Amino acid sequence: DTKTVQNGYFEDAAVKDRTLSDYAGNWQSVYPFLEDGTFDQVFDYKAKLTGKMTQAEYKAYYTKGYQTDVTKINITDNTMEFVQGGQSKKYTYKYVGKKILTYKKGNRGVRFLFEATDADAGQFKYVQFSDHNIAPVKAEHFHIFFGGTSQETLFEEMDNWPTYYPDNLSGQEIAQEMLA
Ligand SMILES: O=C(O)CN(CCN(CC(=O)O)CC(=O)O)CC(=O)O
Ligand code: NA
Ligand code: NA
């Protein structure tokens, strides 16, 4: 991997605070498109390109990465709505900062941290975004992390990173973006 920002190679000083507005939009989980085979062409390509895993190994890795029951997330400049099972839950959020994590392979990434201001947020009280960026820019897709204890609890989760792309894309278009 080239030593670029989006591959996780960046200077600490370039990491800058963001706002929830970077993530505003109507977003969909990519997991159904792994499950229905749309991403098989992605895993075949990755296996042939990098040689680091077989196609089946890549698929298992991304199955663990993408699994979630949160099928849709709708975000405004100050709210997030999670659609999960047969229920929608919407809360107001404030920005609470950022965290630089180091991964086992030696690259790094930044989590951008939000906290619900509503008392009844439960498992959606603490929410983090990772999008391979480190400073303000409109998100094009993201991984999300959420729970009800603290931001710090979520820093331990490294292998499940539910992933979201804009609702206006087909699964095929998401696959194209991943192949690019
Ligand atoms: O982030 C991904 O989608 C898959 N990552 C591994 C998982 N991520 C999780 C994260 O970014 O929060 C870590 C990473 O990309 O180093 C490998 C890759 O991008 O080639
Ligand atoms: Na889930
Ligand atoms: Na997660």
Numbering used by the authors: 321 to 500
Task: Copy text from the publication.
Zinc is essential for virulence and survival and is acquired solely by the ABC transporter, AdcCB, and two Zn2+-specific cluster A-I SBPs, AdcA and AdcAII, in S. pneumoniae. Although both SBPs share this structural core, AdcA also has a C-terminal domain (residues 322 to 501; here termed AdcAC) that is structurally related to ZinT, a periplasmic protein from E. coli and Salmonella. The AdcAC domain is linked to the N-terminal cluster A-I domain of AdcA (residues 1 to 311, henceforth referred to as AdcAN) by an 11-amino-acid linking region. Collectively, our data show that the AdcAN domain is necessary and sufficient for Zn2+ acquisition, with the AdcAC domain and the His-rich loop aiding in Zn2+ recruitment during growth under Zn2+-restricted conditions.
The AdcAC domain has a lipocalin-like fold of an 8-stranded up-and-down β-barrel (β9-16) and a helical region of four short helices (α11 to α15). The structure of the AdcAC domain was further analyzed compared to a truncated AdcA variant lacking AdcAN, AdcAC (residues 326 to 501). The structure of metal-free truncated AdcAC was also determined, showing that only minor conformational changes are induced by metal binding. The metal-binding site in the AdcAC domain is also tightly defined. However, it is highly solvent accessible and is permissive for interaction with Co2+ and Ni2+ ions, similar to ZinT homologs.
